[PDB]
């Protein structure tokens, strides 16, 4: 599981930054958050115990806290109500939620600077290109399913009108047969004398 | 809306360790020219292949220009018949052979890519574009999963109606053969009762 | 940040559907801000904690029982088929009662002054509901992942239990046929053990 | 199945302070046509974009219609990013258009629709609020049901796994007897020749 977001930090408002969050099937089980500005990178890990501690700090249901994390760190910057800020000196990444004249902090994470930003960026670029090819193949598969279903429907429309011509040609045969059956069945009592 | 671009993974034999990325961007056709950008996560190299340059490279190989640009489309826009190489000193020439396992390789192209002085902006522009195109494909999928859902239900609508009719023809066909069997017995009894 | 929005049916204007927004702290008995709107204007007032106790003592019922009735009335539906809501648009008084058998008694009465920023309040109310939807829909993405994760573990658990049960059936029959082979080979040894001593 | 609808908050450039709300409703497929509704909390504007208008704007942009409809899905549905810039004329009460701004200062008019004021905007807002509160109940009901599926599936997982800890114990102890019986058979085979060749050595001794 992996999602790359385009966030806008208050520290450097000019340079648009990228936020890569990676976890395993559940965000409440922990995740790895990466911040990159195209040259250097900052990667930190948020454990399951840290999420429960941050949720218990501001008095919030853990299910509702992960909902806020999955809404601020994964949707991107849709949902501009979140104010992201990363201090490069202290190497801390904190974001807050803005509405109703209240800007309370929602999370405080410690992202340490990576000594191999080239590999981190190339792995990010490689994942974005792999997700691109997957969505392209799924589009070609889906387009093939549409032309097969419509083709299968058109065949089902023509087989029905042929079978409907057969259901009435055969229903008229039973009616023509049951008439002489009932006519001969009464004629069998006449020959009985 | 204008602008066309394809980003590809390339294996540079100069640096076989890492995997380089090639960003080819052009207008509407490769015949008019294209801007080719090479990056490695830290630095970036960009060159502008003019339309005249493609004509010279196609003429020096005695190859039809329409066939030559077909090979440029083949190598730079997909992703190993083609082998790529690039030198880091100053002779910044992104040249790629077409190693054809028929006999031996031969030169296919060569362009000058100068090292840009803002590689961070190039990479962000490269990453930002890749994310935007993934959202467009994801939206195109949501639009298409709704079309296939509508055609499937309309298909199964006519499918159950055909099976409903095809079941009925087999109903009054075994019933038709039943009436044939009854009139067959009444025919035999008409001859036995004739006596 | 506890807030609840619910639609109400005013008997003074029964043709339209008004909306009620109750905002309160951690506990409703401590007080709440009650907002009313009709899609154009809005009226909002404040119910202090002492106003709750004064209303509770005015009808001689326990405070906790009264705040419980406030959760049933001011929260979770209306028009609901038991509580009758009414708002005097002239007097700016929010008055609601509870219908029983043949006796309907007043449950609360609070003053709501008209707000000077009706579009801003509606703009805040819509922004909140859309924000809570994006929050609940994010919890569905998390919880659907938990279902698929638990479904996978259960499915392989039943699959493994089926194989381990089918293994004990092939194995029990294999031992059954093996005890019989052991039974017949013992009868052949005593036959050959005799022929050794008998042919001496 | 009711209808398809999405309500997103947008920030116009004619009034960047207040938060306008954008309501787009369609029937299954977006290319079939949709209805745009703009509101600020007082007045409201409603427009109707048919299937023909979508093909016309797609022919002007020279894009594939599937891409243009996909580009409309990104901007209109769930729109709150700096990629798409929205604009609307209040005094001219017409021409709601939106751009697509990316890096290197590239901008093109992605859409242009003329929506007109509503005579009764209060009823439009109440209907918008009524829908938002209905999905709030529909989502919270889907959660309570999903919470029951999680613990029920965890119940069946613990049950089959504790029955596994009993079934597996019988398999291992039954397999230990299998190998113990095969070894007795193998040794009983070897002890059958020493008796067979001994009988044969008695008849080969006259």
From Swiss-Prot, chain B:
It is found in: Nucleus; Chromosome. The modification Phosphoserine is found at residue 55. Phosphorylations by PRKDC at the C-terminus of XRCC4 and NHEJ1/XLF are highly redundant and regulate ability of the XRCC4-NHEJ1/XLF subcomplex to bridge DNA. Phosphorylation by PRKDC does not prevent interaction with NHEJ1/XLF but disrupts ability to bridge DNA and promotes detachment from DNA. Monoubiquitinated. Widely expressed. Residues 4-132 are annotated as: Interaction with IFFO1. It is linked to Short stature, microcephaly, and endocrine dysfunction: A disease characterized by short stature and microcephaly apparent at birth, progressive postnatal growth failure, and endocrine dysfunction. In affected adults endocrine features include hypergonadotropic hypogonadism, multinodular goiter, and diabetes mellitus. Variable features observed in some patients are progressive ataxia, and lymphopenia or borderline leukopenia. Belongs to the XRCC4-XLF family. XRCC4 subfamily. This is DNA repair protein XRCC4. It comes from Homo sapiens. The chain holds residues 2 to 132 of 336 of the full protein.
UniProtKB/Swiss-Prot annotation, chain C:
Residues 2-131 are annotated as: Interaction with IFFO1. Keywords: Chromosome, Coiled coil, Cytoplasm, Disease variant, DNA damage, DNA recombination, DNA repair, DNA-binding, Dwarfism, Isopeptide bond, Nucleus, Phosphoprotein, Ubl conjugation. Widely expressed. It comes from the Eukaryota. Phosphorylations by PRKDC at the C-terminus of XRCC4 and NHEJ1/XLF are highly redundant and regulate ability of the XRCC4-NHEJ1/XLF subcomplex to bridge DNA. Phosphorylation by PRKDC does not prevent interaction with NHEJ1/XLF but disrupts ability to bridge DNA and promotes detachment from DNA. Monoubiquitinated. Changing residue 89 to E: Abolished ability to bridge DNA. Its main location: nucleus. GO terms for cellular component: cytosol; DNA ligase IV complex; DNA-dependent protein kinase-DNA ligase 4 complex; nonhomologous end joining complex; nucleoplasm; nucleus; site of double-strand break. It is found in: Nucleus; Chromosome. It is linked to Short stature, microcephaly, and endocrine dysfunction: A disease characterized by short stature and microcephaly apparent at birth, progressive postnatal growth failure, and endocrine dysfunction. In affected adults endocrine features include hypergonadotropic hypogonadism, multinodular goiter, and diabetes mellitus. Variable features observed in some patients are progressive ataxia, and lymphopenia or borderline leukopenia. Belongs to the XRCC4-XLF family. XRCC4 subfamily. This is DNA repair protein XRCC4. The gene is XRCC4.
């Amino acid at each position: 599981e992996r999602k790359i977001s385009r966030i806008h930090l208050v520290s450097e408002p000019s340079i648009t930054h990228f936020l890569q969050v990676s976890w395993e099937k559940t965000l409440k089980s922990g995740f790895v958050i990466t911040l990159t500005d195209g040259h250097s990178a900052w990667t930190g890990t948020v454990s399951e115990s840290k999420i429960s501690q941050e949720a218990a700090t501001m008095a919030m249901n853990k299910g509702k806290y992960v909902g806020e994390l999955r809404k601020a760190l994964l949707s991107g910057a849709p949902a501009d109500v979140y104010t992201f800020n990363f201090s490069k000196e202290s190497r801390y990444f904190f974001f807050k939620k803005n509405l109703k004249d209240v800007s309370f902090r929602l999370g405080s994470f410690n992202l340490e600077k990576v000594e191999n930003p080239a590999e981190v960026i190339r792995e990010l670029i490689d994942y974005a290109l792999d997700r691109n090819n997957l969505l392209q193949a799924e589009l070609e598969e889906l387009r093939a399913v549409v032309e097969q279903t419509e083709r299968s429907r058109k065949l089902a429309e023509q087989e029905l009108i042929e079978t409907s011509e057969r259901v009435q040609l055969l229903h008229s045969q039973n009616t023509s047969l049951i008439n002489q059956k009932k006519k001969m069945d009464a004629d069998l009592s006449q020959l009985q004398t």
